Amino acid sequence: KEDREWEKFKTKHITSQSVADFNCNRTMNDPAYTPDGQCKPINTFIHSTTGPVKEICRRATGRVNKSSTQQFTLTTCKNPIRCKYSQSNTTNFICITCRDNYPVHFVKTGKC
Numbered sequence: 001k002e003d004r005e006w007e008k009f010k011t012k013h014i015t016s017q018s019v020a021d022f023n024c025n026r027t028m029n030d031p032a033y034t035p036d037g038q039c040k041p042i043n044t045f046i047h048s049t050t051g052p053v054k055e056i057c058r059r060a061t062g063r064v065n066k067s068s069t070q071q072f073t074l075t076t077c078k079n080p081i082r083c084k085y086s087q088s089n090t091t092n093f094i095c096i097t098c099r100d101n102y103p104v105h106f107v108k109t110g111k112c
């Protein structure tokens with residue numbers, strides 16, 4: 001169900017918060033943004049409106065990994081000590097799995 005996979009991707013990997021306001025310790029432990037479970041060893045959050053992320057797949061057909069053509073601001077929450085994280089940010093391209101027009105999986109930072 002590609003729309004629901006997209007919803008899971010949005011929740012897990014796209015943040016509506018600014019780089020400054022984003023808080024790894026809150027979000028990584030908040031069920032609302034962690035549909036695979038809380039306190040994971042790593043996660044990459046894309047600071048973007050959903051449209052531009054979705055348009056990574058604009059020319060995608062079937063199931064295929066696509067690189068973004070532009071860079072995104074990214075927060076990495078990593079290396080938890082009792083679910084308390086190192087937090088850092090950078091800009092980079094991203095590599096996602098598209099199912100048709102829908103991002104359904106975060107593959108890697110950088111190009112595919």
Ligand code: NA
Nearest residue numbers: 071090091092
């Ligand atoms: Na960069």
